[PDB]
Amino acid sequence: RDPVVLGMLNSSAKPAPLRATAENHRKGFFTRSQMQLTFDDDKKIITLQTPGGNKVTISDEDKGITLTDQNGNTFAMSDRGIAMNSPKDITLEATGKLTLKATQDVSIEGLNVNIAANAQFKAQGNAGAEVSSSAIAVLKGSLVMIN
Amino acid sequence: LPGVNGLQIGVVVQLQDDPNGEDRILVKVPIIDAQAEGIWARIATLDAGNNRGSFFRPEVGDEVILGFLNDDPRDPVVLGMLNSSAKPAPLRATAENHRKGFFTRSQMQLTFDDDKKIITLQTPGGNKVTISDEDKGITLTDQNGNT
Amino acid sequence: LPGVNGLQIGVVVQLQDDPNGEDRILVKVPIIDAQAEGIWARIATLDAGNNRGSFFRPEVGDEVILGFLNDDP
Amino acid sequence: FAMSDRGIAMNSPKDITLEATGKLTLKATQDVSIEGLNVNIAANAQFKAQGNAGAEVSSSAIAVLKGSLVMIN
Amino acid sequence: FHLHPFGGFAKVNLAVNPPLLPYFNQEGELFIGLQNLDPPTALPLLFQVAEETADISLRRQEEYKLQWYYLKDNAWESLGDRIVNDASNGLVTSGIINLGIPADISRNQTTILDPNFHWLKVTIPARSRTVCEIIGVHTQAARVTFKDAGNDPNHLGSPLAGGTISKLAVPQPEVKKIAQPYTSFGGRVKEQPENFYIRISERLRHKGRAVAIFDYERLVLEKFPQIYKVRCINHGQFDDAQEQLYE
Amino acid sequence: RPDAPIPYDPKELNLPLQLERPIPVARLELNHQLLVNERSPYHYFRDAQ
Amino acid sequence: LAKSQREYKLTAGTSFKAGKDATGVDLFYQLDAETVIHKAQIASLKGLFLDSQERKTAAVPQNLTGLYASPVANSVDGKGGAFPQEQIVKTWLPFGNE
């Protein structure tokens, strides 16, 4: 009258999620909907997966961190630095100040570039400043002071 | 057949090549015969189903605990693994008991800290992911210095 | 020694300071003696090995299930 | 921080910073838009801006072009 | 490129003056694609047939036998001399055909069909209406026979229902499943006194020879139990080509 | 593009054409709605080389 | 067969169980010849039909009028339609029609 459950069992009618090998490199948790949290002891990899394609990987072979989306958005930190790729758009918003800085050159490209300040705007090169165009170049203001 | 009382100690011999696709393990019992290779036993686990469950498998030489169905020597069942002074546990026990988690052969860790409320994933190479309440945020750290 | 049938209920008393470095836990059995502190028992777990395994430990007062090797108390 | 079918988005109530010891590159296949209360661009060496179908610099107040020596065309 | 049916293609070399289009010349073709084959081997195939759906106008002539081929990297090769036994008699009754599959069947450079399978083919040149309709085609088939051990005398009086046999008398772990999809065929019970009397009283009158309306009718109903009713027409002829009866 | 091809019918599958690199392609197919002297166009082209 | 096997051999005279009889006795069937079992299965069936003016006279196609194709031959319409669930006998055409 006092039964106690001590664990579940697999069989040939209810197969295990992985096949056993002599090297025995893979472990983890697998669920009904095929979501996985797994460890790989051969390459030292930790991964979280969703059947839709969303994946998070911490890897020693890749020597970094990778976040992959099912839409093609990709974020990566590796020995070459930090990279971000998006097939649609990238946005950045802040309620304080947004600062960008490099110890080397800064490069901005695009089909059109629009810089707009609600207050003063200022650009400065310490060994020469150049503004040019292949078409008409325009300098406009309420009052223009050259030097 | 003459029966058996209580639980017994077993030692793992082989993980793969089950003659039948039943996901069994070859185990021997040292007090019956330490020279023979033993018989195939079933594994009870935390979760199991159709392509579902927790998949952790011992290594050759590991010590396990055995029960028997209907007290029949021909029907062994594995009930879990054991640590000892010859196979130390990954952590030392304390009176406060603040740290829990999973540790693997290659020293990859998924751990919880109940003192400071920290969740961390670590790879021996230095790649780390931390969710912290003391830091009140999220941190991703790479082995190359990317932060 | 007179033996024991089936499985029993135990209660945790102490987690640390095993006289031998074997990673055992002090447990008492309420139907033998609810006043004594009990004896040291081994833990079977999901995964265990050389510096390997799942490390979860109960707290003082938790209820556990006990089996016995060769029906020896 | 979010990645979804609309792309990548970041929002911070306080501040956002970006630092590198090499070169920081920003690139788009469409228009690039920068806004703020004040905009300050400062280079330790040459500074250069270029539009391939026209370049415009303007202000609602005074517009100033300064240098040690100014060469128009 | 040649563009083939079902979505395949083929490369063309103009130095050899190939045809402009893929070439087809036969009235009926059936393609059979197989999985997990390990040549050379032996394939028993079961054809289950609906026996009432064929054309009865004339018997299939000898110039129009069925033909069997196997595929080898976009080239078809004949199987005519590797058939051991065809119990379907050319797809007129249900039965097993026993094919031997040689080792030079190929699947590395197939482009006209799915490259993940091996392919066989059955064709008919003309009068495709003299082939019956199909219910199933299966592999790993065998035929078994009833053996009596003191059973009911009325067992053989009715067919065995489909799905009855699924077990082995001495079970074995290498076999995982057994199936019986259709009913049994061909049984007959041992005679009882009343039918004995009927048979012998009829024989004492027609003497086992057919000379009159009574003789033709009773000699058929006794030999073939699967007939329900029959009629003998005197001095009448039937023309197969016109489907006309001459009175 | 052989590694990002277009199907002939967006409602069915076909096998991708095997090219070593992207090239423009033209398809010539027979018209199935035509009947000339109660015969198909194939009747006229089966024997052409 | 089971997933871990490659081949298996059945010998003549092997017995199979067919339930019980109307009197409560057991029935048995035996195998007629030796057989070997492996893992091959049928994966797909397709059909092709070539129409002509010589059908009404039962001869070889000479004056062609059409070529028809059934990519899923074992179905009601030749392209994957399901059979009505209440139909007892479900048959299909081996080559198709026009």
Numbering used by the authors:
A (entry chain CJ): 443 to 589
B (entry chain EJ): 370 to 516
C (entry chain AJ): 370 to 442
D (entry chain AJ): 517 to 589
E (entry chain BH): 789 to 1035
F (entry chain BH): 494 to 542
G (entry chain BH): 297 to 394
Question: Anything the authors wrote about it?
Answer:
Contractile injection systems (CISs) are a diverse, yet evolutionarily related, group of assemblies that mediate bacterial cell–cell interactions. Their contractile apparatus is homologous to contractile phage tails, using a contractile outer sheath to propel an effector-loaded tube into target cells. Here, we characterized a CIS in the multicellular cyanobacterium Anabaena, with features distinct from extracellular CISs and T6SSs. In contrast to cytoplasmic free-floating eCISs and cytoplasmic membrane-anchored T6SSs, Anabaena CISs are anchored to the TM, which is mediated by modified tail fibres and a baseplate component.
The resulting maps of the baseplate and of the distal end cap reached resolutions of ~2.9 and ~2.8 Å, respectively. The transition from the inner tube with C6 symmetry to Cis8, the VgrG-like spike with C3 symmetry, was facilitated by Cis5 and Cis7, which formed the first two layers of the inner tube. The cavity of the spike towards the tube lumen was plugged by three copies of Cis6. The highly conserved baseplate component Cis9 linked the lateral baseplate components Cis11 and Cis12 to the first layer of the sheath. Cis11 and Cis12 formed a hexamer of heterodimers surrounding the spike as seen in previously studied CISs. When compared to Afp11/Pvc11, Cis11 harboured three extra domains including an extended carboxy terminus. The second additional Cis11 domain seemed to stabilize interactions with Cis12, whereas the third extra domain composed the cage surrounding the spike, which was observed in the in situ structure. The cage was further surrounded by the crown, consisting of six trimers of Cis19, which are not present in other studied CISs.
